[PDB]
Amino acid sequence: LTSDFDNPRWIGRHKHMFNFLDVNHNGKISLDEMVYKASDIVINNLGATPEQAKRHKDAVEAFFGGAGMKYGVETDWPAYIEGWKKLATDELEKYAKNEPTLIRIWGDALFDIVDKDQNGAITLDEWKAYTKAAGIIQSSEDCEETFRVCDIDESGQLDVDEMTRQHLGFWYTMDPACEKLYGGAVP
Numbered sequence: 001l002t003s004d005f006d007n008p009r010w011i012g013r014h015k016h017m018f019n020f021l022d023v024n025h026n027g028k029i030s031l032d033e034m035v036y037k038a039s040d041i042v043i044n045n046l047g048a049t050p051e052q053a054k055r056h057k058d059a060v061e062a063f064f065g066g067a068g069m070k071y072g073v074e075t076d077w078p079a080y081i082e083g084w085k086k087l088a089t090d091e092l093e094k095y096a097k098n099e100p101t102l103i104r105i106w107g108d109a110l111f112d113i114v115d116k117d118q119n120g121a122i123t124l125d126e127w128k129a130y131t132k133a134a135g136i137i138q139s140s141e142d143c144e145e146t147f148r149v150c151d152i153d154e155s156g157q158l159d160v161d162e163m164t165r166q167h168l169g170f171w172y173t174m175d176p177a178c179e180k181l182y183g184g185a186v187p
């Protein structure tokens with residue numbers, strides 16, 4: 001429901017992600033890298049069309065732009081987490097006005113690519129395909145946890161509306177009910 005920026009676990013969740021994103025361990029990451037990673041995944045691993053990839057890129061671009069990242073600029077850890085506070089509150093503000101959040105826009109873009117039927121719902125195998133391609137999750141075990149937490153069994157599908165809700169609490173408010181959204185892959 002609300003921000004929780006001084007919760008060491010909120011900082012830890014994003015510190016983990018920051019380190020996951022800083023593959024070359026430069027201690028900084030740029031928007032160029034983020035958008036490269038986003039498009040490399042959908043085009044080279046998930047077979048998205050140029051149009052789909054484009055929509056997905058614009059979404060990823062806005063997402064990390066909301067955290068203050070920019071092209072031709074390297075964001076270090078301190079700026080990153082500070083910038084994340086702003087992203088989180090802006091997202092919360094959009095939420096309040098029933099305005100599409102940046103994370104919502106991303107999900108829609110991504111699910112249209114990952115969902116074979118292009119309906120906004122993906123299977124456990126599709127979730128695994130995406131998560132393991134991006135690297136955010138490494139084991140099938142942690143991917144199942146996602147469904148266990150979203151309340152969808154191995155045969156049902158994860159819907160974007162439901163996942164969005166999960167992300168609001170996982171990434172923005174530290175909602176206790178969203179713990180283990182990514183199994184043990186993300187603190």
Ligand SMILES: O=C1N2C=C(c3ccc(O)cc3)N=C(Cc3ccccc3)C2=N[C@@]1(Cc1ccc(O)cc1)OO
Nearest residue numbers: 014017018034037038103106107110134136160163164
């Ligand atoms: O949510 C997601 N992510 C959050 C962060 C992330 C990054 C930094 C942070 O501080 C916090 C979170 N990083 C990645 C992985 C990624 C990063 C950059 C480019 C491509 C992919 C990621 N993939 C998503 C995509 C997604 C979006 C909406 C949905 O409904 C379903 C799936 O799946 O859960």
